[PDB]
Amino acid sequence: AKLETVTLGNIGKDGKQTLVLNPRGVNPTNGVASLSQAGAVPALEKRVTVSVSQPSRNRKNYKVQVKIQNPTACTANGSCDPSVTRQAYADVTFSFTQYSTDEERAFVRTELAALLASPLLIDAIDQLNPAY
Amino acid sequence: AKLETVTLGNIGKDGKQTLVLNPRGVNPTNGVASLSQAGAVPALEKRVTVSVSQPSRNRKNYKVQVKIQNPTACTANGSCDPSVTRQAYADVTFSFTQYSTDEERAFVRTELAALLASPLLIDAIDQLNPAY
Amino acid sequence: AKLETVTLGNIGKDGKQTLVLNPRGVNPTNGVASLSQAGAVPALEKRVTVSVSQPSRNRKNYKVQVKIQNPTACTANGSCDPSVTRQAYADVTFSFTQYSTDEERAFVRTELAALLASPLLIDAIDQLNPAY
Amino acid sequence: AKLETVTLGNIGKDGKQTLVLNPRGVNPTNGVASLSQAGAVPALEKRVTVSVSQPSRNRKNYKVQVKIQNPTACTANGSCDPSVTRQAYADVTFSFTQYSTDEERAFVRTELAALLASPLLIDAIDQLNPAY
Amino acid sequence: AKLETVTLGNIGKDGKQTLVLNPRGVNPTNGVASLSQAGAVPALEKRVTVSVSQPSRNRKNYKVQVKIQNPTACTANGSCDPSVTRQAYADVTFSFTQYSTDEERAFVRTELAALLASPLLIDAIDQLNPAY
Amino acid sequence: AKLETVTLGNIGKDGKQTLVLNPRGVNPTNGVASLSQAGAVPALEKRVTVSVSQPSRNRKNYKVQVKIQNPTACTANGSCDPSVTRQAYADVTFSFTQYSTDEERAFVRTELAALLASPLLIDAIDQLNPAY
């Protein structure tokens, strides 16, 4: 990565749609890669922001982070320009020790993806169901 | 949503192992369940903690958080007690408003699992190679 | 050079529209051509300007500058007049040394037109879209 | 955007030559596209680069900046080695609002290509004729 | 000249060792490419960094610079965590004239590799002193 | 590490070139050994020089300075005093601790020569740096 385009498929409530984010680029103060929705509305686009520490000494207990932004907008009466009335977010971090291996980093990655995909969280999030 | 066990299949570097979590120690203060490997001490070491959000009050929105902790164990000779260091962690959160819908929630979480499975994050996590 | 109505055919993302900017004149304040389309208010909005800077005592080489003004307008309320909320524009400079010739002057114009036609700028402008 | 070799054909005084600008890696410290006549000595090299940026601190619009350079050298100017004697450049900046469509952004891009081909600029640029 | 996996071989004291370097991408902090071995395993740092410099307005220095970091660790008896006691380094810089060509630049690089492998430089640091 | 004439071959971008440098003795004030060209004018000679030591009170550790100087000149802007013209230059610094082993030093020398011989750097010093 090296990614010219990022496509997430099998998404949405029924697991049937796709989202294409194109890289905008990498931010040269932050060292942060940034993707956003391929649709032509810069004002109102889905975004993914990605960072990994060098690691530097104070970032040796390194972070890998992805920020997810999904605004929802509509057009107000009397305004040709649409705007966001609600926003949805997610924020995921790893890892953090310098002595972790790719295998452990992956377990955390997948013990996560496999949980996000599990009914516990599907209903705890989609219907705001307390666990009991 | 329910304090049922979770089978996290298809996990690890190649997506081929399984870990099973069993919820316990739910703290009524905040409705947060500790999901962990069932049995002995590893049950205390390898765990995922899951909160469930509820709308409004603080404020006109809500937040969901899951904490992942996977410690590395070893022990001194003659010790009565093993210990863990070089611990792997992750944190995933979600944020939505009080008027949010199920469809926008589904995209934020369904993307996220698809996003974790994307080379974007596989490289950012497994190698620590950000998409540069 | 001498002004005449400039008709720009085959324009817009689909290459189907035509813009017609009449040779209103040249502003003697600064030697700037004024080309516009057509109405009492719209001609003050849809505009192209042109000027030439000759080599000079300020130890300057020569250049040609072209400005593109493409504002649009939206809604109106009880105050009744419409207004511009958005504007697309460009500032186009052609820079040459004092001994530069016609061939070089022509290459810069045509290379740019070829580049504007090329996918690199189709995507830089229609999409996000910085390199990568 | 994505880089690939661009062949800027139908260029120059008679509209008959081609520049073949091969992709160069994109340096993240600015995210600038770089295509060039790579067989050239770097002090000569004919090159096209594109800089694209999003709104940020002190910046409200989206911008695309295009730089075209064509230095020309004398192969052996009383020497054995080439030395640049002539230079010619394009420096074009485009600017768009965040809420904007591709159709609209494209008009400024396409209008310029159509404009570059106009008799007004053929004379304003190739003969360096002032407006009149 | 591009991000790629680099495999070395026929290296080491007996000339029989191999090494594979997995890229980290290009770091926006300074626009510099880097690659490391596993790269997840060498928690104690095994790295190669490659510049990527530009013929800047204030320098015209588009040099190639490669930095090599090779630590050696000691295990503190019954330790769960090994640590570096020695660090070896190498730093190679290639300085160029702006009118230089590929064969000129290659003469120096190929000359250097041929020299590093020569008995004179091998003896000076394998066992001895400044040459005599 | 006695200086003796060093003959290099299989050098240049195509690996088709030789170079012979003869000992000129050693600079006694800094231990900088030198291999000279067989010509009459030092200004235009290709040469290689070397010195290795651990300073008594700038220590740190042991470092070696390996330097390549390749001046170029031509008689057209000559023939008298055909000055430089395409100067090429490179060097290597290596450093080791007092405990570095014999194989450690060998490893680093060979790792570097193997990298210099790698396609990554073969192309980096030529027409394109690994900006991406």
Numbering used by the authors:
A (entry chain M), B (entry chain F), C (entry chain O), D (entry chain H), E (entry chain K), F (entry chain D): 1 to 132
Paper passage:
The coat proteins (CPs) of single-stranded RNA bacteriophages (ssRNA phages) directly assemble around the genomic RNA (gRNA) to form a near-icosahedral capsid with a single maturation protein (Mat) that binds the gRNA and interacts with the retractile pilus during infection of the host.
Although the number of T = 4 or prolate particles does not increase, to our surprise, almost a quarter of the VLPs purified by the modified protocol are smaller than T = 3 particles. Further structural characterization of these smaller particles revealed two previously unreported forms of VLPs. One is the oblate form with T = 3 and Q = 2; the other is a small prolate form elongated along the 3-fold axis from the two T = 1 caps. When produced from an infection event, and purified via size-exclusion chromatography, the population of the oblate and the small prolate forms are around 21% and 3%, respectively. When over-expressing the gene containing only the cp and read-through (referred to as A1) fraction of the Qβ genome from a plasmid, the percentage of the oblate and small prolate forms increase further to 35% and 12%, respectively. The “over arched” type, which provides more curvature with a θ angle of ~130°, includes hexamers from the oblate and small prolate VLPs. Our results, showing that over-expressing the 987-nt cp/A1 gene leads to more percentages of the oblate (from 21% to 35%) and the small prolate (from 3% to 12%) forms, suggest the length of the RNA being encapsidated may affect the ratio of different forms of the VLPs. Additional densities inside the capsid were observed when performing asymmetric reconstructions of classified particles of the oblate and small prolate forms; however, due to the lower resolution and potential heterogeneity of the RNA, it is not feasible to model the RNA inside these VLPs.
